[PDB]
Amino acid sequence: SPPSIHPGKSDLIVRVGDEIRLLCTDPGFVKWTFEILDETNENKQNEWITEKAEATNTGKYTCTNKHGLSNSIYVFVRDPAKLFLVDRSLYGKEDNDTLVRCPLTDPEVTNYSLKGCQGKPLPKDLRFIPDPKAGIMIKSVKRAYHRLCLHCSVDQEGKSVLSEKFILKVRPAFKAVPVVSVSKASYLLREGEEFTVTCTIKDVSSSVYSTWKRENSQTKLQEKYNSWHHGDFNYERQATLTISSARVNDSGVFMCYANNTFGSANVTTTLEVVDKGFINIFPMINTTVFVNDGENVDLIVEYEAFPKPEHQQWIYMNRTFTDKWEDYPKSENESNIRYVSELHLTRLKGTEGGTYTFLVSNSDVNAAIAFNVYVNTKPEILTYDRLVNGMLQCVAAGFPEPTIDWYFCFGKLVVQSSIDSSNGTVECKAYNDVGKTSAYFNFAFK
Amino acid sequence: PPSIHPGKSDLIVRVGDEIRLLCTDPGFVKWTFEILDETNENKQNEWITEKAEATNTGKYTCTNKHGLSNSIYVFVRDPAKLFLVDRSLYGKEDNDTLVRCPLTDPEVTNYSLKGCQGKPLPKDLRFIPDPKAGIMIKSVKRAYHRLCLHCSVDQEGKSVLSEKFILKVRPAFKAVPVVSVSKASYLLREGEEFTVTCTIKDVSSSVYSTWKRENSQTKLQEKYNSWHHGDFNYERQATLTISSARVNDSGVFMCYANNTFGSANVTTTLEVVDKGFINIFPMINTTVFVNDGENVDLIVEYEAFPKPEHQQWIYMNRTFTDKWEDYPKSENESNIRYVSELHLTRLKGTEGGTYTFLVSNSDVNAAIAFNVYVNTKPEILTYDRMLQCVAAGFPEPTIDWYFCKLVVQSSIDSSHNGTVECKAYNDVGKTSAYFNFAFKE
Amino acid sequence: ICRNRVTNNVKDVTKLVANLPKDYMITLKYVPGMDVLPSHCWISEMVVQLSDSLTDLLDKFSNISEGLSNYSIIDKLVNIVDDLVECVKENSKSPEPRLFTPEEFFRIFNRSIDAFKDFV
Amino acid sequence: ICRNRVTNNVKDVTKLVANLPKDYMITLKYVPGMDVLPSHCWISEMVVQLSDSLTDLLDKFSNISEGLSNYSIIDKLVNIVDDLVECVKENSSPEPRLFTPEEFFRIFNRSIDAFKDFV
Numbered sequence A: 001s002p003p004s005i006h007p008g009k010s011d012l013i014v015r016v017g018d019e020i021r022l023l024c025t026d027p028g029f030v031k032w033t034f035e036i037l038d039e040t041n042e043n044k045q046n047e048w049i050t051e052k053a054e055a056t057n058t059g060k061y062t063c064t065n066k067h068g069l070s071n072s073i074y075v076f077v078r079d080p081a082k083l084f085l086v087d088r089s090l091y092g093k094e095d096n097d098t099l100v101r102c103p104l105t106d107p108e109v110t111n112y113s114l115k116g117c118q119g120k121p122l123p124k125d126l127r128f129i130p131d132p133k134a135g136i137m138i139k140s141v142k143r144a145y146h147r148l149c150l151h152c153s154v155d156q157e158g159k160s161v162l163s164e165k166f167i168l169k170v171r172p173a174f175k176a177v178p179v180v181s182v183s184k185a186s187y188l189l190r191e192g193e194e195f196t197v198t199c200t201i202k203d204v205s206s207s208v209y210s211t212w213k214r215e216n217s218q219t220k221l222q223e224k225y226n227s228w229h230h231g232d233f234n235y236e237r238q239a240t241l242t243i244s245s246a247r248v249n250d251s252g253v254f255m256c257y258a259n260n261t262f263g264s265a266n267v268t269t270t271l272e273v274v275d276k277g278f279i280n281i282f283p284m285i286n287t288t289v290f291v292n293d294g295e296n297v298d299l300i301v302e303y304e305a306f307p308k309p310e311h312q313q314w315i316y317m318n319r320t321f322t323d324k325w326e327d328y329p330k331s332e333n334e335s336n337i338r339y340v341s342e343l344h345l346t347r348l349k350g351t352e353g354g355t356y357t358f359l360v361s362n363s364d365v366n367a368a369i370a371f372n373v374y375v376n377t378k379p380e381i382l383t384y385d386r387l388v389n390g391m392l393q394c395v396a397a398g399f400p401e402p403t404i405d406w407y408f409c410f411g412k413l414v415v416q417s418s419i420d421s422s423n424g425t426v427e428c429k430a431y432n433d434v435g436k437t438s439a440y441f442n443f444a445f446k
Numbered sequence B: 001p002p003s004i005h006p007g008k009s010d011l012i013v014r015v016g017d018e019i020r021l022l023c024t025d026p027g028f029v030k031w032t033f034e035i036l037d038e039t040n041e042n043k044q045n046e047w048i049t050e051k052a053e054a055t056n057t058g059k060y061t062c063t064n065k066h067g068l069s070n071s072i073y074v075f076v077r078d079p080a081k082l083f084l085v086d087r088s089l090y091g092k093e094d095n096d097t098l099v100r101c102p103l104t105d106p107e108v109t110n111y112s113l114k115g116c117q118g119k120p121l122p123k124d125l126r127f128i129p130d131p132k133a134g135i136m137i138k139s140v141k142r143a144y145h146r147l148c149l150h151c152s153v154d155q156e157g158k159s160v161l162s163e164k165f166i167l168k169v170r171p172a173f174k175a176v177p178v179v180s181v182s183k184a185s186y187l188l189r190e191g192e193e194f195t196v197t198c199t200i201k202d203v204s205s206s207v208y209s210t211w212k213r214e215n216s217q218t219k220l221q222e223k224y225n226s227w228h229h230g231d232f233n234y235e236r237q238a239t240l241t242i243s244s245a246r247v248n249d250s251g252v253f254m255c256y257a258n259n260t261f262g263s264a265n266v267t268t269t270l271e272v273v274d275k276g277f278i279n280i281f282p283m284i285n286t287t288v289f290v291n292d293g294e295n296v297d298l299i300v301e302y303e304a305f306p307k308p309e310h311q312q313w314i315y316m317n318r319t320f321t322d323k324w325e326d327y328p329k330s331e332n333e334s335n336i337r338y339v340s341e342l343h344l345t346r347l348k349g350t351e352g353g354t355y356t357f358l359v360s361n362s363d364v365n366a367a368i369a370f371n372v373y374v375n376t377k378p379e380i381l382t383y384d385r386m387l388q389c390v391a392a393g394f395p396e397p398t399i400d401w402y403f404c405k406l407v408v409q410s411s412i413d414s415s416h417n418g419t420v421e422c423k424a425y426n427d428v429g430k431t432s433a434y435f436n437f438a439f440k441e
Numbered sequence C: 001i002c003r004n005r006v007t008n009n010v011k012d013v014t015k016l017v018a019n020l021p022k023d024y025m026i027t028l029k030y031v032p033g034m035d036v037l038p039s040h041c042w043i044s045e046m047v048v049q050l051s052d053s054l055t056d057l058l059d060k061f062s063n064i065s066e067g068l069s070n071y072s073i074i075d076k077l078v079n080i081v082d083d084l085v086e087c088v089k090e091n092s093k094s095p096e097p098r099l100f101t102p103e104e105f106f107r108i109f110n111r112s113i114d115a116f117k118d119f120v
Numbered sequence D: 001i002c003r004n005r006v007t008n009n010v011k012d013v014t015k016l017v018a019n020l021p022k023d024y025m026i027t028l029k030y031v032p033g034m035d036v037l038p039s040h041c042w043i044s045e046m047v048v049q050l051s052d053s054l055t056d057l058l059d060k061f062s063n064i065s066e067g068l069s070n071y072s073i074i075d076k077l078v079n080i081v082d083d084l085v086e087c088v089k090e091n092s093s094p095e096p097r098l099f100t101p102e103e104f105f106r107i108f109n110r111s112i113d114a115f116k117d118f119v
């Protein structure tokens, strides 16, 4: 049998400074219990007496038997001084109801409502329901209300009366995901260098969880952190991952990971540690190139070099070539390890057929690739003779090796023909792909 | 002269006691009273206040028809208030400065000056007290600036401190103002809005600065910006501006700065011109002569205001690419002068002709032309058999007959066992063709 | 365990103290002997009281765009302490009001933040 | 005359006001009728008082190296007012009242404005 109370009312009213007196009749009576806001008192007299009521005595009074069953009365203290009772703390989960702890000490008052500080009208879509026993409650708290400033207001004698001033604060719901970005995307290092990568996480709240883990390995790395709050609902974190002396085994994938109750985001960086630096070299043309005298040729190498190449030079016949050669990284990316070099030989002479060498070095390695240039020439005839046998010779020179024909009516090859003719004109006519030259001689009888 | 009872120079009266003074002089005009910046005058030869306040410490003077004068000076001993103060304290640098904390009671010992928050006074600050006046500070330096001071008295072993005095110092000028101008020299098209800035740095805002058009006392309309940057450190920026600079507005401008120590001036010169202009000088004769396969460098050096919008080099009315190069002759902000170069390597001998340089701005276009000849040791084109030898040259071939770019022909009648040689030559060299005849059988 | 929830803006506090008058007065319900009684007996009360106190200061200042201002710094400190309140309520009667010059009040604040980083 | 003494560090005042507590109180020996009267009579006494008040106010703050600070701004203003005191003295006390920073800086700005076409 849940316990029974004298006086008999659900709500009861006393003037300030005037006695309060409650009796609970149960043979199983245990306890009397009084609540308002966070204040709670527990008492085991059969009757509760307070000969000097105060506004703070406003609250709820609840009586319990050993059956474990309870009956309550709610008690209100008229006090012209303090019409409200407050706890300033006011926090809201975004999209949850939030309660504004301003319960009234008199229930017999009108237009219990909520009003902005400094005259400002509350946001149009804010809407609320009042309860004199609890406070006023705000439906579906949304981010605009953050540090919204509130008063609770009540009318007495036609005069309009306000509580001490309240600030709502709002604790985000997550409705999107963390945003995560990494300072450099791929890394290459000499063994023994220090490795430092920084990862940046942005979210509406610092309850984002973020980590650095190494893929296909579950162990937590060691990390240093920096955080900023960049005004309302704007939080940024930076996380730094360091290996102070990088081993080759360190090579692999590092993942920067960041989950919130909406869901995870990840971004990875890849690391190569190498024991010593390299220079690979890739010629872009064949290593043997052919040019006609006074035409133009380019020699082009592309090469991969780490650490960054320190000298790069072009030499001809053991003399260092200058101001004919231009070199550029293939891509401007931070991860490019790659370079292109060119030598432009313009209006080449037959005399500079020969060998052209490219030499490049970084701190660990020196590498060279060599080119051979054959400058084609139109043939010439350079000797002609008429000889005691009745027999004839001519000598022709050039590259590719020329050809010599007879008619009647590194560097230059050398080629010769003989024929005996024993009235008119004998010719040597001399040709290769490049050009043709011809020489003539005559002999007579009388 | 007059006489005053009580007889002595000085009187001491307990707070709330009567002060009574009579001057006996039949030409008497007035008592007169003053302490700190207070003043009172009375034409009544008998002067009373029945309850002397602490403030009624001061100096009281009697004055007459003669202009003769006698004074009495009066203390009001109040254990509650031992100083009169005036909190405003100013010093001029290396003048003695006085700290107005005169005492209301003279029978006190160790009257002295002491630094606030228990800090000790600087080592070479020193002072002379007077109970009637305050305490006077010798030879103020600049390091005493914004020093904080208290006035310290011992009275019956009891020790008393004034309200804060804070000591602040008018610098005395000991070096010339320091003056700087954004640019030493300007050139502008007429129409341009000339503007220059002059910067003056000194210890105090009372430095004086002006902009003067050279050779005139007329005043130029100018606008100012100024900052204090720490103590005894002032900076002013004063900017002259003309909306449309004219040719007769072209001329010389001075920025002048002055303080009680001395004067500094800095000057800027303004050229204004009516037409934009370009002038060209070749570094080399316009005719150039080249051996075939020698290297050539062509150079044009030119002064161009406003800055040139094009540079191109053209050869026989075809546009020339990737062998021409430009740089200003100086990096500096004054620079109007530019160099352009064209580089030709191992010229072919077909490749003589005219090479021209064209430069333009928004107002002028200018052209300079170079004529380039490419010599060759003559190349014998054709040998044919009367037999002819025909030779292709610059300069003109010279042709020889032996028996044992222009084109020029020679021929000879062939009419014993023989070789006959043709030699074609000029200043570049020799090219030779052999045609050979034997009579046999 | 919430040592991550303090954002490093707190280093700004020394600039904030430098920009407050030495004899301004700030009002805080000082939980007794938190200088005395151990790190976890006061901290739950103190962090909520500091929240109220700092929002009071935040009312006193006004915002300026260009540069750092007392309003910026206090705004960010209220974000810190209100997230610490959210934490202490998840992870785990009023002292009488008391008045502090900025140096003393911020010493209390920095003592609370230091108390947080080693918490059960 | 004395226009040159006031430097444009006065623009800093609006930031100083924004950066001081609205409930803070500053103490000034006012020169009543200040608003109604012509400039010349009150301005002479006012600059002297403003010097005193700004100096005491200057003590309350402490110096910051990285970026602008109230001690810096007030130090510059104190220089201005002490220069104006000097020019007033060399070219040409009511009881204290307590002002919020906005009020006190209005009074200051009006005093510095009294040196635009001052006689």
Ligand SMILES: *[C@@H]1O[C@H](CO)[C@@H](O[C@@H]2O[C@H](CO)[C@@H](O)[C@H](O)[C@H]2NC(C)=O)[C@H](O)[C@H]1NC(C)=O
Binding pocket: A209, A259, A260, A261, A262, A263
């Ligand atoms: C976000 O990341 C954390 C850590 O990885 C997750 O919390 C872990 O969840 C597993 C079970 O799923 C537990 O066994 C671990 O003990 C938890 N670790 C920690 C440090 O709490 C969390 O579940 C992830 N998901 C979300 C929505 O936060």
Ligand SMILES: *[C@@H]1O[C@H](CO)[C@@H](O[C@@H]2O[C@H](CO)[C@@H](O)[C@H](O)[C@H]2NC(C)=O)[C@H](O)[C@H]1NC(C)=O
Binding pocket: A257, A264, A265, A266, A267
């Ligand atoms: C890391 O991020 C990637 C996406 O950026 C995730 O890859 C996706 O995962 C889902 C579920 O497995 C797949 O349906 C998608 O096809 C995947 N997209 C891509 C591009 O791979 C990945 O699951 C995340 N991994 C971790 C450990 O966080």
Ligand SMILES: *[C@@H]1O[C@H](CO)[C@@H](O[C@@H]2O[C@H](CO)[C@@H](O)[C@H](O)[C@H]2NC(C)=O)[C@H](O)[C@H]1NC(C)=O
Binding pocket: B208, B258, B259, B260
């Ligand atoms: C600065 O040079 C001026 C002149 O510009 C000095 O003397 C002044 O000269 C003008 C006439 O050019 C007079 O009208 C001024 O009144 C002169 N000054 C005085 C006090 O008579 C001037 O004094 C120099 N500045 C300083 C601080 O000495």
Ligand SMILES: *[C@@H]1O[C@H](CO)[C@@H](O[C@@H]2O[C@H](CO)[C@@H](O)[C@H](O)[C@H]2NC(C)=O)[C@H](O)[C@H]1NC(C)=O
Binding pocket: B256, B263, B264, B265, B266
């Ligand atoms: C501007 O400054 C220069 C010095 O920087 C002054 O030049 C001097 O003028 C006097 C004659 O008046 C000469 O005897 C000195 O030899 C000059 N000194 C130098 C270094 O040239 C100049 O007089 C100043 N002019 C003005 C108007 O101030």
Ligand SMILES: *[C@@H]1O[C@H](CO)[C@@H](O)[C@H](O)[C@H]1NC(C)=O
Binding pocket: A247, A249, A250
């Ligand atoms: C890297 O090499 C060392 C041995 O020098 C070893 O102790 C360590 O476990 C290795 N790390 C990995 C990830 O293999």
Ligand SMILES: *[C@@H]1O[C@H](CO)[C@@H](O)[C@H](O)[C@H]1NC(C)=O
Binding pocket: B246, B248, B249
């Ligand atoms: C410059 O030229 C214009 C027009 O001739 C004239 O009005 C002006 O007075 C001249 N100014 C000077 C300094 O000569």
